[PDB]
Amino acid sequence: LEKLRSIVSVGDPKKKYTRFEKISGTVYTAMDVATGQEVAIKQMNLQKKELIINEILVMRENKNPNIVNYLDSYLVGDELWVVMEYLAGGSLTDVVTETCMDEGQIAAVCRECLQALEFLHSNQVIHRNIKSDNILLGMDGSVKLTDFGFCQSKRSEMVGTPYWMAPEVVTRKAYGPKVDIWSLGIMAIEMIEGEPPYLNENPLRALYLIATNGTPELQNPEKLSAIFRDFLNRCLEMDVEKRGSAKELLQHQFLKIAKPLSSLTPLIAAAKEATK
Amino acid sequence: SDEEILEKLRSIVSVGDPKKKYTRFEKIGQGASGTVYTAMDVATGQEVAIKKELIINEILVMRENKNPNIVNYLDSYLVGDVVMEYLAGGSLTDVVTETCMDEGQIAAVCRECLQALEFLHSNQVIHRNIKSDNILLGMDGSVKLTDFGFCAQITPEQSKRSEMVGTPYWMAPEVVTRKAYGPKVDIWSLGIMAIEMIEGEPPYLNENPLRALYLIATNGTPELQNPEKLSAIFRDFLNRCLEMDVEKRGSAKELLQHQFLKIAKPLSSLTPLIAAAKEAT
Numbered sequence: 216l217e218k219l220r221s222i223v224s225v226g227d228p229k230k231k232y233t234r235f236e237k238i239s240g241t242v243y244t245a246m247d248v249a250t251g252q253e254v255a256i257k258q259m260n261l262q263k264k265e266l267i268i269n270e271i272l273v274m275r276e277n278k279n280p281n282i283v284n285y286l287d288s289y290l291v292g293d294e295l296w297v298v299m300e301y302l303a304g305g306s307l308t309d310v311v312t313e314t315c316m317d318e319g320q321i322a323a324v325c326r327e328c329l330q331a332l333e334f335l336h337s338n339q340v341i342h343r344n345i346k347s348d349n350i351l352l353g354m355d356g357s358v359k360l361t362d363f364g365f366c367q368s369k370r371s372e373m374v375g376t377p378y379w380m381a382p383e384v385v386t387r388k389a390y391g392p393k394v395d396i397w398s399l400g401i402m403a404i405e406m407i408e409g410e411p412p413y414l415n416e417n418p419l420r421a422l423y424l425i426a427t428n429g430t431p432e433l434q435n436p437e438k439l440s441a442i443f444r445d446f447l448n449r450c451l452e453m454d455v456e457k458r459g460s461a462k463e464l465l466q467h468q469f470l471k472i473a474k475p476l477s478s479l480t481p482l483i484a485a486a487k488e489a490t491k
Numbered sequence: 492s493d494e495e496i497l498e499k500l501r502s503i504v505s506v507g508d509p510k511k512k513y514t515r516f517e518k519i520g521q522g523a524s525g526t527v528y529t530a531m532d533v534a535t536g537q538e539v540a541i542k543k544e545l546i547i548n549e550i551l552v553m554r555e556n557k558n559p560n561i562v563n564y565l566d567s568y569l570v571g572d573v574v575m576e577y578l579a580g581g582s583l584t585d586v587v588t589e590t591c592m593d594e595g596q597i598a599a600v601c602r603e604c605l606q607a608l609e610f611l612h613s614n615q616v617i618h619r620n621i622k623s624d625n626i627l628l629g630m631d632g633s634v635k636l637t638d639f640g641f642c643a644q645i646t647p648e649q650s651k652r653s654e655m656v657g658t659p660y661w662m663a664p665e666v667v668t669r670k671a672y673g674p675k676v677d678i679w680s681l682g683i684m685a686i687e688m689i690e691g692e693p694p695y696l697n698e699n700p701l702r703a704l705y706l707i708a709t710n711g712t713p714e715l716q717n718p719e720k721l722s723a724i725f726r727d728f729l730n731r732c733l734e735m736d737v738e739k740r741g742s743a744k745e746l747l748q749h750q751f752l753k754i755a756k757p758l759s760s761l762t763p764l765i766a767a768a769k770e771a772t
């Protein structure tokens with residue numbers, strides 16, 4: 216608990232933040248009273264402690280501009296408050312479902328996600344859940360990853376479809392950083408198709424297809440540019456050794472058609488207007 | 492309309508105060524999903540356990556298919572953003588993994604489950620997820636079936652399904668291979684549950700879920716590790732549950748008449764197993 220006292224901040228967070236709106240514990244949106252910065256606050260009743268504290272410690276040291284970044288934490292009575300930056304642009308999922316992203320906007324998102332993965336993979340972190348729900352957007356078009364850990368019963372039934380998982384993860388083989396690269400390729404296909412790859416398809420059937428067919432089938436490849444399809448083929452190489460690393464793919468030609476991140480801002484406005 | 496499906500779910504349940512009908516709320520062993528508790532009917536003292544398209548189907552299925560061999564749904568409440576009967580003896584998984592049941596004890600459990608399946612199948616409800624984990628036991632030794640989240644309702648106009656739903660290790664061959672299938676996939680899954688009672692585990696549990704599916708598609712009827720330890724009559728009952736030929740596989744009605752079930756012990760014989768399982772926990 217003395218290390219818990221080494222991470223918590225001095226202050227009453229009820230005084231430093233206002234406009235608490237509710238949206239492993241509850242999640243509020245709030246606003247820094249002194250600067251007006253929007254924040255997201257997660258509240259957790261401590262009474263698997265030791266993991267929570269270790270994670271807080273590694274978050275605060277390994278900041279990165281393409282990761283939803285920790286701000287502070289507070290010991291509030293019996294519960295721990297963890298304060299993150301709030302990204303008000305919403306999730307990539309909303310953008311993907313309400314707009315048709317062009318390849319330039321896709322390349323931009325892919326570059327930003329690959330920068331995050333290079334950072335994480337250099338510190339030996341595996342995200343394991345690279346997918347559109349876990350990509351948050353800022354109102355200036357920033358792109359940041361969320362919902363992963365810095366630090367699954369065979370008897371249980373599958374809910375729902377794990378469409379983002381690499382073949383080596385579905386076969387429950389030990390796996391490494393390249394599973395994120397597979398997931399990113401799936402997400403790029405989702406962006407251009409407007410839907411996750413496996414709908415109308417049962418989870419166990421999807422599991423078998425991921426394991427057997429592997430490199431996912433896309434509708435009408437002739438819709439894609441040759442360089443986008445090459446990029447997808449580098450990401451979705453069933454052979455792990457051949458599959459590109461984050462560092463290698465940051466060099467890929469497809470990323471050089473990326474539009475400025477401001478090009479994402481009209482997509483955000485369109486998504487917000489549609490919901491509702 | 493992804494909000495019309497929610498609106499339908501709310502309409503199917505009524506608004507009232509649960510805390511004004513049940514008391515003594517206590518967070519029981521919640522798991523993956525969570526929010527499982529125990530309570531006490533204020534008026535009668537009855538002990539209860541309280542926890543979108545699929546949720547709707549399951550609630551509906553439960554309300555219209557009540558039976559002594561099914562964990563009875565008691566009431567539903569809507570407050571802001573499911574009462575069931577409580578079976579203090581725990582799951583059959585705790586028994587099969589921590590104890591060695593004898594043939595009389597196995598036959599008794601199989602009969603109660605076959606009684607459950609005869610009732611569902613005659614009401615055209617296929618469970619599709621039979622396994623020891625969905626068998627709950629009373630402190631008097633009663634055996635009840637739960638979890639209708641995967642169940643299919645069939646008709647004479649559509650009597651078959653083709654969907655890979657269930658839990659791999661227990662799935663029938665015709666489900667794994669996406670052939671049209673009917674109520675007898677539950678019979679197969681009961682036979683796998685009998686193997687659980689014999690060996691402690693369904694076949695291939697050491698394999699991975701996907702490897703296990705391929706092995707079911709390619710082996711068909713699984714092999715007991717030690718068949719010679721079973722009476723020929725138990726061996727026979729098992730063989731009619733795990734028949735590859737759906738036509739030759741026994742129905743719930745036909746298997747309730749099997750001779751293996753004649754050696755069943757009374758349900759009181761299961762309470763020593765429950766005590767062993769609790770102790771083993």
Ligand SMILES: CCCCOc1ccc(-c2cc3cnc(NC)nc3n(CCCN)c2=O)c(C)c1
Pocket residue numbers: 242255256257267270271283297298299300301302303305306348349351361362
């Ligand atoms: C266990 C210690 C690790 C840190 O623990 C947290 C992780 C993430 C978040 C979060 C950030 C966030 C930022 N921006 C937006 N904008 C929509 N939302 C956010 N959310 C809501 C769900 C995001 N999928 C969060 O939960 C929060 C509040 C806490």
Ligand SMILES: CCCCOc1ccc(-c2cc3cnc(NC)nc3n(CCCN)c2=O)c(C)c1
Pocket residue numbers: 527540541542546549562573574575576577578579580581582624625627637638640
């Ligand atoms: C999502 C669809 C609605 C679900 O509707 C329910 C289904 C099952 C149960 C349940 C009963 C129960 C009875 N008795 C005991 N004995 C301890 N436990 C029970 N549990 C705990 C897990 C059992 N595997 C339950 O979840 C409950 C409480 C609700």
